[PDB]
């Protein structure tokens, strides 16, 4: 999903 991959911990 590159930029839309989960950005949280």
């Amino acid at each position: 999903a590159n930029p839309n991959a989960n950005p949280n911990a």
Partner: antibody
Amino acid sequence: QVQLVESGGGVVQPGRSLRLSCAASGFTFNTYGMHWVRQAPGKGLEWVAIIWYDGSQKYYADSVQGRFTISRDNHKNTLYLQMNSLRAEDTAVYFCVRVRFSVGPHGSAFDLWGQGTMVTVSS
Amino acid sequence: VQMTQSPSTLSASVGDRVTLTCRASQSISSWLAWYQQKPGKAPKLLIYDASSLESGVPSRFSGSGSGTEFTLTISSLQPDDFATYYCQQYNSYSFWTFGQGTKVEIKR
């Protein structure tokens, strides 16, 4: 008090730079990806930048690439937007925005928004 | 991905059932959020993942749709529901784009 508070807005002359701050409180800031989203007067919302919870990945809209830098200080719970080469079409309210917590491979919607700080690019 | 909302404006009365439409230019599966915004304030998240109701949001709001066509329904319009409504995609590899918004105003 789960909130985001932006500061650092004001009048800036075209070509000059500006740093926006966003103070987060009431939640575990350093576990959240964060965004900036802007809204020009009379128009809709435009995504600007994303930063991973740890600062390890950053992405920007084409309209601001190479001019805007997003960063964060996780020990002080602040998000930053460094804007250089500001132009007239950057004139907008700037919101710092938290992504809704999700487990899994995918990021989520925008669940927490600051009050917004106005940036006006005028000579 | 470009998002388009219709109508740009619409006039409704308290107690009306109102449906706002949002269309993606290509499939976004169900990675779609709806927001409410009133003048001078920040947007408020209503619906995420095209149909899931955000925690504080009253049950008269709902959403449905997948792929390229999505709708936000207010089952019974109430006085504080007059506002601008935005849809927004967060599909994989698609970054984040918003519709131009649908303003709901008071019919008289």
